[PDB]
């Protein structure tokens, strides 16, 4: 809080934004943009039920 | 032995148990491309950002 | 104070990168800041300002 009175808020000196963690993996399929996940399985697993 | 040959009520029975057995396996085994095969590793990851 | 004044110039401050992501289109640099590392020698510690 400034002496003039004028409140010094976060926007003020600074852009706030739901971004992400993570910045470093892009990731497209078949050129569009998306997200995906691996599945690594377990070990007493059945490949084809699961 | 050459015991079941006097008796092939026995040895009838012996392969309806065999092949009843058969199927219960068989309908209930988990099914792999590999089974595991690798030595077990264990994974740290730490992360330090920047 | 010799105490908080090592704790300080002997550190391993992260400096980060210099254009990393988000980084903004057409960016062709990507390096490493080096800003301090941890003291090796007994020399380097006796040079360590305490005031
Ligand atoms: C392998 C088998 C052992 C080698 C051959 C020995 C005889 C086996 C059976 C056999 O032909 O014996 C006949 C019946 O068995 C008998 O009289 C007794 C059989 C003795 C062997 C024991 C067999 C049982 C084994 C069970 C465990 C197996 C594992 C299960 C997961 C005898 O002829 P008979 O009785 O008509 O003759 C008397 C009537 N006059
Ligand atoms: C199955 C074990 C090896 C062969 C045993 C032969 C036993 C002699 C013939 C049967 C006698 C009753
Ligand atoms: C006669 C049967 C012999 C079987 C032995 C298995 C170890």
Redesign the interface.
């Known amino acids: 809080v400034q002496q003039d009175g004028s409140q010094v808020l976060l926007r003020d000196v600074a852009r706030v934004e739901l971004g992400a963690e993570d910045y470093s993996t892009v990731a497209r399929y078949n050129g569009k943009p998306a997200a995906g996940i691996a599945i690594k399985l377990a070990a007493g697993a059945n490949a084809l039920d699961t | 032995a050459n015991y079941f040959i006097d008796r092939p009520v026995f040895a009838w029975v012996l392969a309806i148990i065999m092949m009843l057995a058969g199927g219960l396996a068989i309908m209930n085994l988990?099914?792999?491309?590999y089974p595991?095969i690798a030595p077990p590793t264990i994974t740290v990851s730490a992360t330090?950002?920047? | 104070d010799v105490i908080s004044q090592i704790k300080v110039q002997n550190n391993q401050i992260s400096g980060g990168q210099l254009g990393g992501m988000p980084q903004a289109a057409d960016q062709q640099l990507n390096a490493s800041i080096i800003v301090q590392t941890r003291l090796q020698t007994p020399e380097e510690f006796g040079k360590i300002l305490l005031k």
């Open positions: 988990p099914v792999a491309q595991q330090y950002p920047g």
